[PDB]
Structures are given as structure tokens and as C-alpha cells.
Amino acid sequence: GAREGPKWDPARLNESTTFVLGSRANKALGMGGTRGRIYIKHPHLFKYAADPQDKHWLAEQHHMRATGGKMAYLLIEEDIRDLAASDDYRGCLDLKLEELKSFVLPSWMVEKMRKYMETLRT
């Protein structure tokens, strides 16, 4: 097998396999970039804004309370493998989805995450 996924097969992942923040994400998507093929090439890439109340919990998982610099975002890790096949991310020497640091939201956060998605789902 290869190491271009979470463990062996990134496709096996579901729509709720995990979530990836918006910090240090460039790494998994090649550090040698400019803006982000995920925020341009993937105009249909699901994105969940980290509310001010949720940030409290996410901060514990991120282990870094960045006042600013960049806006964090929660995206389905499964959707990453797709965007990873972009024009640039396509087999990038600095592409390591295995270290996407993705994680599944708790039964608490998912609450607002579900009702929220419904807005962009229906």
C-alpha cells in the first residue's frame, strides 16, 4: 500500500470520517503554495466555520490559541483526498494527507454542525 491517505485507503472514508481545522493545513496540501486550491479549485468543498463557543473545545485539540493570523475551518477529511487531486496538490512532494490531523467532532459540537450544514444542504 501507499501513504497518501489516513491509513491505507482514503476512499473508504465516509462523509463523517473526520474533520480538519484550517491551521497548518497547507502542510498536508503542500507547503509550497500561494492561496489554496481548496478555497478556489474546490468551490464545492464543504466548510464549517468554527464558532466562538466551539473554538474553546477546538483549542484543546489544536493545542494552540492563535489570536489571529488565519481563520480556522472544519472540513471533512474525506473531502480532502478529493481536493488533494487538484492541479497542484496532485502528487505533491509536500503532500501528506496522512498527517491531516483530522478528528471526529464530539456529540456536542456535531449538534450545531448538523443543523448548520442543513443550511447549505437544503
Short mmCIF file of C-alpha atoms in Angstrom, two decimals:
data_model
loop_
_atom_site.label_atom_id
_atom_site.label_comp_id
_atom_site.label_asym_id
_atom_site.label_seq_id
_atom_site.Cartn_x
_atom_site.Cartn_y
_atom_site.Cartn_z
CA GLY A 1 0.00 0.00 0.00
CA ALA A 2 0.88 3.69 -0.05
CA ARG A 3 0.82 6.60 2.40
CA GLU A 4 -1.44 9.02 0.53
CA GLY A 5 -4.36 8.56 2.90
CA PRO A 6 -5.49 8.29 6.54
CA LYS A 7 -4.19 4.73 6.89
CA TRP A 8 -4.31 2.87 3.58
CA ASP A 9 -7.48 3.76 1.68
CA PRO A 10 -8.77 7.35 1.95
CA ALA A 11 -11.72 6.41 -0.24
CA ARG A 12 -13.11 4.01 2.36
CA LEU A 13 -13.72 7.12 4.47
CA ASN A 14 -17.30 8.34 4.81
CA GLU A 15 -18.91 11.79 4.77
CA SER A 16 -18.30 11.91 8.53
CA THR A 17 -14.91 10.21 8.79
CA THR A 18 -13.28 13.20 10.47
CA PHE A 19 -12.73 16.97 10.41
CA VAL A 20 -9.65 19.06 9.65
CA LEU A 21 -9.02 22.54 11.04
CA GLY A 22 -7.86 25.49 8.96
CA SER A 23 -4.46 25.84 10.63
CA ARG A 24 -1.24 24.25 9.38
CA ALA A 25 -3.40 22.62 6.71
CA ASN A 26 -1.04 23.82 3.98
CA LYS A 27 1.36 21.07 5.05
CA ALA A 28 -0.95 18.20 4.11
CA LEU A 29 -1.73 20.19 0.96
CA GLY A 30 1.86 21.10 0.14
CA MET A 31 3.52 23.99 1.96
CA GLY A 32 4.87 25.34 -1.31
CA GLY A 33 1.71 27.14 -2.36
CA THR A 34 0.17 30.60 -2.53
CA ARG A 35 -3.51 30.70 -1.55
CA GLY A 36 -5.19 27.30 -1.57
CA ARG A 37 -6.60 25.09 -4.32
CA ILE A 38 -9.20 24.05 -1.74
CA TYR A 39 -10.51 27.61 -1.48
CA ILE A 40 -10.54 28.10 -5.25
CA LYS A 41 -10.21 24.89 -7.25
CA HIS A 42 -12.74 23.28 -4.92
CA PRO A 43 -15.67 25.75 -4.87
CA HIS A 44 -17.88 22.90 -3.68
CA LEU A 45 -15.70 21.95 -0.71
CA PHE A 46 -17.81 21.77 2.45
CA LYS A 47 -16.58 24.13 5.17
CA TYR A 48 -17.79 24.59 8.74
CA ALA A 49 -16.91 27.88 10.44
CA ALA A 50 -15.60 27.39 13.97
CA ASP A 51 -17.98 29.40 16.15
CA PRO A 52 -16.65 31.42 19.11
CA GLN A 53 -18.13 28.92 21.56
CA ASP A 54 -16.75 25.87 19.76
CA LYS A 55 -13.27 27.39 19.47
CA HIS A 56 -12.96 26.71 23.20
CA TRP A 57 -13.05 22.95 22.60
CA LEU A 58 -11.17 23.00 19.30
CA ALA A 59 -8.40 24.93 21.06
CA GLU A 60 -7.81 21.86 23.23
CA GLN A 61 -7.42 19.66 20.16
CA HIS A 62 -5.30 22.21 18.31
CA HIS A 63 -3.13 22.93 21.35
CA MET A 64 -2.62 26.47 20.04
CA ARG A 65 -4.65 29.59 20.82
CA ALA A 66 -3.85 31.77 17.81
CA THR A 67 -5.44 35.19 18.28
CA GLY A 68 -5.33 35.82 14.55
CA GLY A 69 -3.13 35.32 11.51
CA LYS A 70 -5.57 32.96 9.80
CA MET A 71 -9.18 31.79 10.06
CA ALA A 72 -9.64 28.16 11.10
CA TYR A 73 -12.20 25.95 9.37
CA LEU A 74 -13.60 22.44 9.86
CA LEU A 75 -13.71 20.33 6.69
CA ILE A 76 -14.46 16.63 6.20
CA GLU A 77 -11.16 14.76 5.94
CA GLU A 78 -12.82 12.53 3.34
CA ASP A 79 -13.27 15.61 1.15
CA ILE A 80 -9.54 16.29 1.47
CA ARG A 81 -8.49 13.22 -0.52
CA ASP A 82 -10.59 14.65 -3.35
CA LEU A 83 -9.12 18.17 -3.33
CA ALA A 84 -5.68 16.59 -2.93
CA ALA A 85 -6.04 15.57 -6.57
CA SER A 86 -6.03 19.22 -7.63
CA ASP A 87 -3.81 20.58 -10.40
CA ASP A 88 -1.01 21.34 -7.93
CA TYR A 89 -1.77 19.10 -4.95
CA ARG A 90 -1.74 16.26 -7.48
CA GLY A 91 1.04 14.11 -6.06
CA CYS A 92 2.83 16.99 -4.37
CA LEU A 93 6.26 16.32 -2.87
CA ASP A 94 4.95 18.15 0.20
CA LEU A 95 1.60 16.36 0.21
CA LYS A 96 0.95 14.27 3.32
CA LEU A 97 -2.77 13.72 3.91
CA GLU A 98 -1.76 11.05 6.43
CA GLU A 99 -0.89 13.91 8.79
CA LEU A 100 -4.10 15.85 8.18
CA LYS A 101 -4.55 15.82 11.95
CA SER A 102 -8.25 15.26 11.27
CA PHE A 103 -10.61 14.33 14.11
CA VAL A 104 -14.28 13.50 14.60
CA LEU A 105 -16.32 16.18 16.36
CA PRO A 106 -17.95 15.31 19.72
CA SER A 107 -21.65 14.60 20.25
CA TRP A 108 -21.89 18.22 21.41
CA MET A 109 -20.25 20.09 18.54
CA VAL A 110 -21.90 17.85 15.95
CA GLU A 111 -25.20 19.21 17.26
CA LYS A 112 -24.63 22.68 15.81
CA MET A 113 -22.62 21.19 12.95
CA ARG A 114 -25.63 19.18 11.80
CA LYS A 115 -28.25 21.93 11.98
CA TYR A 116 -25.69 24.22 10.36
CA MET A 117 -24.97 22.02 7.34
CA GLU A 118 -28.72 21.83 6.74
CA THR A 119 -28.46 25.49 5.73
CA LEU A 120 -26.10 24.67 2.86
CA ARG A 121 -27.69 21.26 2.30
CA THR A 122 -31.36 22.19 1.92
#
